[model samples]
Target: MGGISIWQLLIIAVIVVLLFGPKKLGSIGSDLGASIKGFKKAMSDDEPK
Candidate 1:
């Protein structure tokens, strides 16, 4: 089935940006890094590696 055109995706992205703000979305790299680090920390703590 043909579902969702490119324009629909762009509109969804625009709505998300408006909801989150450019700055909030822009700093996602740092936030994601910290989240991954914490997740890995917990993972290593759970088992020997």
Candidate 2:
């Protein structure tokens, strides 16, 4: 099958919202953003040997 379409994405979004509710979902988003930021920093840092 072809890759997911817009409709599939929309459905998944709705399911996540239903499962997590708005407040918890917002917290999850914030945590995910911080994790990504930390990961990027670690990847770019050059430690002395």
Candidate 3:
């Protein structure tokens, strides 16, 4: 089978947006970004000089 196309993603995104309000999704996105950023900082800080 071929890869998932943008059209398929478009539909999936719309369904997710409706299922979980756009505002909730925005908060989740921001939290995920911050968590990743924090993880990177922690990893860098843990390295020995």
lDDT of all predictions: 0.81, 0.84, 0.84
Q: What is the TM-score of each candidate against the true structure?
A: 0.50, 0.53, 0.55
- Consecutive 10-residue window with the lowest summed lDDT within model 2: 1-10
Q: Give the residue spans of candidate 2 off by over 4 A.
A: 1-3, 35-49
Candidate 3 local lDDT, residue 6: 80
Please give, for residues 1-49, the per-residue lDDT of candidate 3 as tens digits. Answer: 1526888888888889999998999899988889798888989968776
Off by over 4 Å in 3: 1-3, 36-49
Report the backbone clash tally of model 2: 0
* Candidate 1: tens digits of C-alpha lDDT, residues 1-49: 1536888888888899999998888798667778788888888858765
TM-score of 3: 0.55
Better of 1 and 3 by lDDT: 3
TM-score of 2: 0.53
Q: Write the per-residue lDDT of candidate 2 for residues 1-49, one digit (tens) a residue.
A: 3536988888888998999999998888988889898877997877655
lDDT of model 2, residue 42:
90
Better of 1 and 2 by TM-score: 2
Candidate 3: give the clashing pairs: none
